């Protein structure tokens, strides 16, 4: 029984988003970034969990270079940086982490951000239909510390693991192929059965 608990079902950090810096990039937090995890989270209607993020940065060839990086987390409602010299970078209320590529990957924890009591994956209404307003976790912005252009191309990988997962209102699991990240529509003409068939 201990194997099928929610925490075991939703443990095992998975790669959510990859960032390329061939000199900054924004990555809005989205669990759906993990390809196979949307169908797993949609099986309930409400969730409440804390996330751990790990940032594994390296060159496109996987080689480790001596460069300083800054990943800043802007909480929901804060403005995003628009360039490499925006005043949003020096803001104290957007927590940052300064790590070299030689040091072990940065590991930060983000608590439950929603003003409601649970993350809801389906909004049966309007705040534009189906736009769940208070599901926004924040945003992670990555840039290389320094004023001049960096000497190496970088690839940043993000691994997210949920801890303390709580769920409510189970529902049937998706069987059709996903088309859009926000609304659940399918392809009506190319509708398929749940599984395989036979002859008799």
């Amino acid at each position: 029984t201990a194997e099928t608990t929610l925490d075991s079902f939703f443990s095992r950090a998975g790669l959510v988003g990859e960032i390329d810096l061939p000199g900054y990039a924004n990555w809005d937090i989205d669990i759906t970034g993990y390809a196979q995890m949307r169908r797993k989270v949609e099986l309930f209607t409400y969730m409440r969990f804390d996330a751990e993020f790990t940032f594994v940065a390296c060159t496109p060839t996987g080689e480790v270079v001596p460069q300083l990086l800054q990943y800043m987390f802007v909480p929901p409602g804060a403005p995003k940086p628009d360039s490499r010299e925006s005043l949003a970078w020096q803001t104290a209320t957007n927590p940052s982490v300064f790590v070299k590529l030689s040091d072990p990957p940065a590991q930060v924890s983000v608590p439950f951000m929603s003003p409601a009591s649970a993350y809801q994956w389906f909004y049966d209404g309007y705040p534009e239909y189906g736009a769940m307003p208070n599901n926004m976790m924040g945003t992670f912005s990555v840039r290389t510390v320094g004023t001049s252009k960096s000497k190496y191309p970088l690839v940043v990988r993000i691994y997210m693991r949920m801890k303390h997962v709580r769920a409510w209102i189970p529902r049937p699991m998706r069987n059709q192929n996903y088309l859009f990240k926000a609304n659940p529509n399918y392809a009506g003409n190319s509708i398929k059965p749940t599984g395989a068939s036979r002859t008799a």
Binding site: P170, R171, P172, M173, R174, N175, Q176, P184, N185, Y186, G188, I191, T194
Partner: peptide
């Protein structure tokens, strides 16, 4: 419902008994 099999939501009719 135009497509009762997917229930206009891409979810199977066969599994509604969880509700």
């Amino acid at each position: 419902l135009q497509h009762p099999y997917v229930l206009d939501a891409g979810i199977p009719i066969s599994q509604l008994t969880v509700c």
